[PDB]
Design a protein around this ligand. Structure first.
Ligand SMILES: NC(=O)C1=CN([C@@H]2O[C@H](COP(=O)(O)OP(=O)(O)OC[C@H]3O[C@@H](n4cnc5c(N)ncnc54)[C@H](O)[C@@H]3O)[C@@H](O)[C@H]2O)C=CC1
Ligand SMILES: NC(=O)C1=CN([C@@H]2O[C@H](COP(=O)(O)OP(=O)(O)OC[C@H]3O[C@@H](n4cnc5c(N)ncnc54)[C@H](O)[C@@H]3O)[C@@H](O)[C@H]2O)C=CC1
Ligand SMILES: NC(=O)C1=CN([C@@H]2O[C@H](COP(=O)(O)OP(=O)(O)OC[C@H]3O[C@@H](n4cnc5c(N)ncnc54)[C@H](O)[C@@H]3O)[C@@H](O)[C@H]2O)C=CC1
Ligand SMILES: NC(=O)C1=CN([C@@H]2O[C@H](COP(=O)(O)OP(=O)(O)OC[C@H]3O[C@@H](n4cnc5c(N)ncnc54)[C@H](O)[C@@H]3O)[C@@H](O)[C@H]2O)C=CC1
Lengths: 331, 331, 331, 331
């Protein structure tokens, strides 16, 4: 005889179970951007957030929940314990250790590895069938780490790899050609960051190859210096971090885009990081970005792009470096 | 023989005026939430951002540009100079000091009134015809301030006001009833702050008045203590602030909602702050929230909510404090 | 080797379980408006169509497919055999005779019950767990029929019922008020047809009772003749049929609206056809519209609207008319 | 006191300038498919419809209006009088005779020109600065006709052209490769009809040339027979017309795609009919489809595709046919 029972006659028993649920692990700037991007595209019927910093955590969930009136994601949960994560179709990992001067390289990744040693088994425990999307840097190596710890088949472990990189290149291409980024095509492949590969030959508007029309494209001997676009892609992140302290909006939109293909089983093609041992002369267990078909089973297929022998070596080189790092890691 | 000329044949050297342009002033946590919300709802063809911190400004502009590939707003610009703002349909003011843990919105007034005296005249010079949407706290007073300085008729100066408070209210109502906030209706009017008014008589689902079903609603002796919903609404800012340091996502979605009504001339009804002199008897030029019809000319109409004498006494009470602050003000 | 195989390396194979499949039975004018609306709101990952007219079926199927580039529904299938229907979460029934000019929906009952004998058993055989969304007229009776035939628990058999009449009501109220229909609240309940009942007491804007403000709302003496608004809702279908031969856009949009709450587990409240025995003096298995919570398990709850003795009498009358037809039925 | 006066306190009158108005001329199958797809993408703040058949026109308008609750387009009007179309940003012409089974679109010319002789002056009179989007067939000749009669600069006279043919092409391409159409690139250029030209050289996935992998692509030689994909494109309209009698959904989606780029000033690239005298060796005022940047001013730029030797001759032949027809046109 409460107000609720006087107002509502109940008919049904107890069968909840979110059908289309996503978890984001890490509520730093990247994680919440992914979160907001996912809420505003209606990708999920349940959103769960996890982090080890409890005050931050809860505060972010509340803020988001207070905007429910303007969303169509009817349940938003969070917490330090991975039970809130239960039965997620997709889990996005952004958590990472904060970097720091006064230490070199293996230190950084090993530290993140120590964190994934606790995060990963927790996620698989609660969502043994989910697809994993890794965003934490260095991304290609952490995707391998997530892949090894989890035990998942390679199709279900995906690193954001060069996805944003390629988005950046398309913005810059579009800005020069006075064309919208959707209509400028170009792929940034390989290792996310400094050693990424701009595949000039695939660069085009409307099917029209820019290399075929402008042979100097991507070389050092070109009056337009297109090579600069790619050097801008590599340096844009540092630039943004220098300017604002971190990047968030763009990687969030970027990750929402992947989530959409997967949640909705689109089979769109996106540059993401995948386990390519057995391709391009690559002989070790390493993750690099190639064009992958993304749907309800994660990466079900990838595109074999034809690469120049120079592009092959760049890839190979990255592979040897990631493997060198990886074989020194403590799991 | 440039690549661009070889690739693209130009028809129109010409270039039009900005048509569906929004400017956000202040790119802090609220400003950027508003920006991203706006961009994900396709509300504008041009987004302009202004701040006094240059590097932060450039950083946020670039991060947003980097996700252009996934958006549908082809022009994103920024600058310290208000020329980048010209011909904006809507200008959103999110700049100024924010609350520390426990601090009253009312303790921000002198320093935000200063800031406004420098911002507004610059906004007006470049967009004499825009609607002004004020978010900065204390929002009801700053809406009065924007109004006096700009010289705009009252229909074009809107305070985000109680649109957030009512959304929080519906969120909690919905959590109690197990119904989506879109289907739970209820209004919080007055000051966006401690002295806001829950109009118990309008709370309902499917048109059935909860007050009528349960006459103790909103009363001390209400065994269900619905009063507490209002008090959690009142307290929501502090709780979230003390948890993550500020609020942003909700006000972001809230602000996008108002923008949507304005840009698309929807004529929907929202609780926002407006000049209510000549209502509820109320005598002075005070701005506070009451439901308003919102559209291409801003606030074209006010809804006359029926209030009990207690409610009206609270509203007027709020009107009294607020005018006392404005009247003493600096400009 | 095949072009496909030189371009694409396959990791998995052809998995094929759709997670959010919708079926539309009947590709007439209503079926196809429901389809395109659903397609444009991204409610499904697979859409399947069926009809007995095979050439028409294929054409519609193909015309939607040719628009895939512009959609986010990656599989569209059709067939006269219900196997194309397998594993649907939501099956929408729009097949059957429709009203000629001036014709009562009730006059359609025997023809439509005759095709339901076949359609319902076939749909349940391939989607035993689906929710059933009935649209064919007379919609309340056919919801009862589908319920009796299928054996489904009543939470999973839903009539589109008065979502459309309420929407038309709010359109007309908004027109009189200069307010977007979204901010007008008004419920049309009971038979989707001539015996419908407008609930005067729940009509409001911003939570303010129009009836309390204007105590003659809904009455014969009312100078404003608001009762004319409901007459218009009652006549609306007839006027549209007389003008264009049938109706389709509004229903397509109403059905997509119900589908959305169901597929995204929103728990929004709509006026839909459901079993009302036990309420308002009704002692038989009558199906008509009452406000219900719609979510992933169909109707989970009913809002118990409070009615004036006049309002209730009218509703009980609508229930008698309906029962009077149901009882004679033989299927 | 009337309800409205009692409820709402008015601030001002004014009201006028529609901000983003679109008009559809012709409410047949095609026009309403355009109307609905535009309504569901929130591209306009006002939509006007016209037709010569008065009852049908009013009926469709009412049907759309009855769906207002589910839309964000606050005003829909219609009339046989073109004053209802005043100040449209975009006017879409779908009126006219359509193909019977097996009929060439070129056979409709004399019938549709006579219609355009009355229509174009009426549209331009009320909306002198609108962009005109032509859909009636034969769409390339009628775009030329609209251009001659209206006196508009060529940027503002656009034929929906091959946007649809290319969408068909990418749909079939994607079916063959197991990849979403969004991710399959390929262009169909020239006449929207039997003489269209598939540009094999620009066909690709992730920038990887299908023609380079598979040199016999598109010729009579290839065991894969890719040419049949283009034949299905040319034939698609007839097959569908035979099945269902006309086509409607894909064109409506195609047109809504174009409208989006025009209304939101996206500068995306589409194959649409435009004036190409001066290109590929063509010397008369022929309009046909090439990739064009579309934005707030219509077509601002064309993309110069590199066409193989065989492709240039086809286009020419295509231009010759059309011109031959044109030369004989009287107006
Ligand atoms: N792949 C790409 O293109 C991009 C990758 N990133 C990477 O994304 C990651 C996130 O960056 P930000 O959000 O700015 O960093 P952040 O430091 O603000 O976020 C990390 C969050 O994860 C939490 N965390 C740490 N260990 C955890 C664990 N044991 N379990 C759960 N939560 C844990 C932290 O408390 C923190 O809230 C960084 O590694 C960054 O390098 C950032 C931008 C782009
Ligand atoms: N109305 C409402 O419901 C709510 C209001 N707020 C208010 O929003 C305001 C900002 O909040 P946050 O964004 O978190 O603060 P913030 O510190 O993150 O950002 C404020 C921004 O304003 C900028 N700014 C200061 N003076 C300026 C001027 N002269 N011209 C241009 N930009 C200037 C600052 O540089 C800063 O980037 C505060 O007043 C806060 O109280 C916050 C939440 C809700
Ligand atoms: N509930 C509501 O608010 C509304 C309901 N309707 C009702 O929807 C129904 C359909 O209307 P329209 O689409 O305009 O009719 P329509 O005449 O345009 O199409 C009816 C379709 O049903 C198919 N059909 C007939 N028997 C079938 C069976 N055995 N199995 C599969 N398909 C079969 C026909 O082949 C045809 O394609 C009518 O009953 C009409 O009264 C119409 C508007 C609103
Ligand atoms: N370009 C493309 O990809 C496509 C073009 N079409 C063309 O679209 C056109 C429309 O076809 P439907 O909509 O299926 O035909 P429809 O027969 O369904 O409707 C044609 C409408 O135009 C109206 N109309 C006729 N004469 C008129 C005049 N003098 N002034 C104003 N309105 C007039 C009619 O009353 C009728 O309502 C046809 O020319 C068709 O070939 C159709 C599909 C695709």
């Amino acid at each position: 005889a409460t107000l609720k029972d006087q107002l509502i006659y109940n008919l049904l028993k107890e069968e909840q179970t979110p059908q289309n649920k996503i978890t984001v692990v890490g509520v730093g700037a990247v994680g919440m951007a992914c979160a907001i991007s996912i809420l505003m595209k209606d990708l999920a019927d349940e959103l769960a957030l996890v982090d080890v910093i409890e005050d931050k955590l809860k505060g972010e969930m509340m803020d988001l929940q207070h905007g429910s009136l303007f969303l169509r994601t009817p349940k938003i949960v969070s917490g330090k314990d991975y039970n809130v994560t239960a039965n997620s179709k997709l889990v996005i990992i952004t958590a990472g250790a904060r970097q720091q001067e006064g230490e070199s390289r293996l230190n950084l990744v090993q530290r993140n590895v120590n964190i994934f040693k606790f995060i990963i088994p927790n996620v698989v425990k609660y969502s043994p069938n989910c697809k994993l999307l890794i965003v934490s840097n260095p991304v290609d190596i952490l995707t391998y780490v997530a892949w090894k710890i989890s035990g998942f088949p390679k199709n279900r472990v995906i690193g954001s790899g060069c996805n944003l990189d390629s988005a950046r290149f398309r913005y810059l291409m579009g800005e020069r050609l006075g064309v919208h980024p959707l209509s400028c095509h170009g792929w940034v492949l390989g290792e996310h960051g400094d050693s990424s590969v701009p595949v000039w030959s695939g660069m085009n508007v409307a099917g029209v190859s820019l290399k075929t029309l402008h042979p100097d494209l991507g070389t050092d001997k070109d009056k337009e210096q297109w090579k600069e676009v790619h050097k801008q892609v590599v340096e844009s992140a540092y630039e943004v971090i220098k300017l604002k302290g971190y990047t968030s909006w763009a990687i969030g939109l970027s990750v929402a885009d992947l989530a959409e293909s997967i949640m909705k089983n689109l089979r769109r093609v996106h540059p993401v990081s995948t386990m390519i041992k057995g391709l391009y002369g690559i002989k070790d267990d390493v993750f690099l970005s190639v064009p992958c078909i993304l749907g309800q089973n994660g990466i079900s297929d990838l595109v074999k792009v034809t690469l120049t022998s120079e592009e092959e070596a760049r890839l190979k080189k990255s592979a040897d470096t990631l493997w060198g790092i990886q074989k020194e890691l403590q799991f």
